């Protein structure tokens, strides 16, 4: 049930200075990156071309080499259009791609944030402002929608190219997408008093961590957030309040796909 995400982040500091950087994710694995300094898009995975031929890829990259330069000048020209209404510094963020579902069905999106607020999306055959968006955007929208050729292409990329590509990505990357990596747990404590159960290096993300006295799951166990490691595995911790002296006989228990049913039991 994997989501393919292109994340464009563009900064516009003043009239002249601008940079645009993207990353691409399939699920929670990075497949591409494209740094403002690079003329071309980089693969972060051996399979990042999916099942596209070299022709199909070059053509796709070229589509984008031109979009990057063009997007930039268009935002600049729109700032000229609104001013002094709106002004630099400006941050535009794009989130685009498609979610793939059982078998054939899919759903594409293209969402735009301005100054970190979601305001615009491509939907159907045109750009439209979403709810809560400021009315002034109605001018940029009307101008963007005048560009018939940009619209036709965006429709083609959302409707056809994106799911086609992702269909092929999932095939090329099954091996990495389905990798199983065992977590490793350790315990530690701090004053307030508070026990910690560190679980690190597991993949994929779904995991279970509860403190326990025997077979008794503790009420107050607090799951922290999933933190990433640099080698594409996950880190999580779980904390539990205790009166000093009560540490005796407490276990951290970890369930996870990689372990094939041998839960990690760590006593204190």
């Amino acid at each position: 049930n994997y989501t393919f995400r292109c994340l464009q982040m563009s900064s516009f500091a003043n009239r002249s200075w601008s940079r645009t950087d993207s990353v691409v994710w399939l699920g929670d694995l990075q497949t591409h990156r494209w740094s403002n300094d690079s003329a071309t898009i980089s693969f972060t995975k051996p399979w990042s071309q999916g099942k596209l031929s070299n022709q199909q890829w070059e053509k796709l990259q070229h589509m984008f080499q031109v979009y990057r330069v063009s997007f930039t000048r268009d935002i600049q020209e729109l700032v000229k259009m609104m001013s002094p209404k709106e002004d630099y510094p400006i941050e535009i963020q794009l989130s685009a791609g498609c979610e793939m579902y059982p078998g054939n069905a899919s759903e594409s999106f293209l969402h735009v944030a301005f100054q970190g607020k979601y305001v615009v999306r491509f939907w159907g055959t045109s750009w439209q402002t979403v709810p809560g968006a400021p009315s002034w955007l109605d001018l940029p929208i009307k101008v963007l929608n005048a560009d018939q050729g940009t619209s036709a292409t965006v429709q083609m990329l959302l409707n056809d190219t994106c799911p086609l590509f992702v269909r092929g990505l999932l095939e090329a990357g099954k091996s990495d997408l389905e990798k199983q990596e065992k977590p490793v747990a350790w315990l530690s404590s701090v004053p307030s008093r508070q026990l910690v159960c560190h679980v690190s290096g597991f993949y994929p993300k779904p995991v279970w961590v509860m403190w326990m006295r025997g077979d008794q799951e503790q009420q107050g166990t607090h799951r922290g957030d999933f933190l990433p490691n640099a080698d594409e595995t996950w880190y999580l911790q779980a904390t539990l309040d205790v009166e000093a002296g009560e540490e005796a006989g407490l276990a951290c228990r970890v369930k996870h796909s990689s372990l094939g049913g041998q839960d990690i039991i760590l006593y204190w």
Partner: T-cell receptor
Amino acid sequence: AAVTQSPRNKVAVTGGKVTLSCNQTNNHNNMYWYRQDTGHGLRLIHYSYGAGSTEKGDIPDGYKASRPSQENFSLILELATPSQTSVYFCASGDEGYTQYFGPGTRLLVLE
Amino acid sequence: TQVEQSPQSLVVRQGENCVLQCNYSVTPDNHLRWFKQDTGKGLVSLTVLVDQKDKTSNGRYSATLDKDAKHSTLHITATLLDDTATYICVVGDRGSALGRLHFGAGTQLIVIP
């Protein structure tokens, strides 16, 4: 989709203030000024996206722009020089890609 | 100088056909427009080509555009005296007012009556 320029032809001395005017009734938000010199294609000097705004084009040096209103776009040369001898076209457009051109104004600046 | 026209000038006898060429490196190339400009006058639009491989016509004028070759030609069938004019190629880099027009320097046609 009509555009007028005034004057249509001007003789001016070095150091003179010259004003070239453009008017359009189409309610077009967008106006543009260009000069045409043989052996070159048209070149953009200044443009405007609406009343009270102007923007530098590719060759702005020696020209000021004035957009007092929706109808009017003016090219002002404060200190005219012989090098501004040319034919000047004004243009207008809505959001779409077409620019509708004026009939052009010929200028000669003498010493 | 991203829009080159050829030939720079030509002389034809009334009744003859001619082909004018335009070659560009503008990016992107949304559309291409041919203007006709009579000596001492304004720019009259003959045709605008917008598709990847495109063909248009307007009386004795016809034109082609190939966006891969970044090439356009303009054909005048059975020239007449009033075709004496400068013919100007123009490329527009957006499908909207966000664009800039890139003008060729033109081709000068003289028709011997």
